[PDB]
């Protein structure tokens, strides 16, 4: 009904609207935001998660990754090679040096063409997956370390911590560092805050067209598909927007600036790249709507110790009527990707 084009929406909450995170996600879903797979939320001007970023040069990036990319004609495979630990001061120097710094350009479309032209050359280092938060401890609004969503049931009931999923990660970017096409682990939501630096650019495919992207990718990389159903979960697959266009896959793009949040929605495929030196913070989260996606997520089996969350506690608490059916393997619920989460009822009444 809402957002029939499934385009990426941008929201400008007041501080009063901003305060309750889970409630605001329910709101943006009542406006159809989830249909795009990706949304931007620009927080109120008064809001700041940290007073200054002057004190982080000594922060250690324990496992920076050099991103080797192979391919041509809009189809690539990215190999992430772990380098030795380095400090943020050491990373920033390399990021801003003549060898790695952002090229000169006029319009964004020019920078994007240079990205897709040059991504296999001069492999960059991405300071990815760093355990930590740059939020100050007093910040109660949209705090990536404590969003208070039902994803908290995992740790609360089982004691299980899954780094980056129910804890925060930092990402130190340089020019041409990339994230491959993926949905989140267990098809969760994600939140991404750009603390400082140059922009991060995103592509998204509506969840309602996700299966179409998978079929396409399977055809483009038939060997990877035969060795693992969920091979996109390896996060090694890059596909240009020209290729998506050429094969009729609906998608949108958006650029995230310093100070801005992005939200990804269950089964919303996304990929992108950093423009230059920057720092993002991110984690996963859930709403009641996610539980069915969690139940039905197609997971990677071919690699050891991949992220798998027991859905039992969620089905018992929030779907008691279906619990026995689901344990018997007879729960044939079909997901409607257009429907907002039940918690949005407040805003739809």
């Amino acid at each position: 009904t809402l957002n029939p084009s499934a385009r990426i929406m941008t929201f400008y909450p007041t501080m009063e609207e901003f305060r309750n995170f889970s409630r605001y996600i329910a709101y943006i879903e009542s406006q159809g935001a989830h249909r795009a797979g990706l949304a931007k939320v620009v927080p109120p001007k008064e809001w700041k998660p940290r007073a200054s970023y002057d004190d982080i040069d000594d922060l250690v990036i324990p496992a920076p990754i050099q991103q080797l990319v192979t391919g041509q004609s809009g189809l690539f495979t990215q190999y992430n090679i772990q380098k030795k630990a380095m400090t943020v001061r050491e990373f920033r120097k390399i990021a801003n040096s003549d060898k790695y710094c952002t090229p000169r350009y006029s319009e964004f479309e020019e920078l994007e063409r240079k990205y897709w032209k040059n991504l296999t050359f001069n492999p960059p280092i991405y300071g990815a997956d760093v355990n930590g938060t740059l939020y100050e401890k007093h910040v109660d609004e949209w705090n990536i370390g404590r969003l208070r969503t039902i994803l908290d049931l995992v740790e609360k009931e089982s004691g299980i911590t899954i780094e980056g999923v129910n804890t925060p990660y930092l990402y130190f970017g340089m020019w041409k560092t990339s994230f491959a096409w993926h949905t989140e682990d267990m098809d969760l939501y994600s939140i991404n805050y750009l603390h400082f630096g140059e922009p991060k650019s995103w592509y998204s495919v509506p969840p309602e067209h996700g299966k179409r992207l998978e079929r396409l990718a399977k055809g483009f990389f038939p060997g990877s598909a035969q060795s693992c159903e969920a091979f996109l979960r390896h996060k090694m697959t890059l596909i240009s927007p020209l290729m998506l266009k050429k094969y009729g896959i609906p998608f949108d793009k958006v650029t995230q600036e310093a100070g801005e949040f992005m939200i990804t929605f269950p089964y919303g495929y996304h990929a992108g790249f950093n423009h230059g030196f920057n720092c993002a913070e991110s984690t996963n989260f859930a709403t009641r709507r996610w539980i069915e996606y969690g139940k039905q997520a197609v997971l990677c089996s071919c690699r050891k110790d991949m992220v798998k969350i027991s859905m039992d506690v969620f089905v018992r608490k929030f779907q008691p009527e279906r619990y026995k059916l689901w344990k018997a393997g007879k729960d044939n619920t079909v997901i409607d990707h257009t429907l907002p989460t039940p918690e949005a009822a407040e805003f739809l009444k």
């Binding site: 990754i65 080797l68 990215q78 190999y79 992430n80 090679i81 991405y126 990815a128 997956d129 899954i162 780094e163 980056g164 999923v165 990660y169 990402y171 994230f179 491959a180 682990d185 390896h234 996060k235 090694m236 996963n284 690699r303 110790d305 991949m306 992220v307 798998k308």
Partner: peptide, 8 residues
């Protein structure tokens, strides 16, 4: 397990 940016 943990979340990862990608593999090789």
């Amino acid at each position: 397990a943990r979340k990862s940016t990608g593999g090789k």
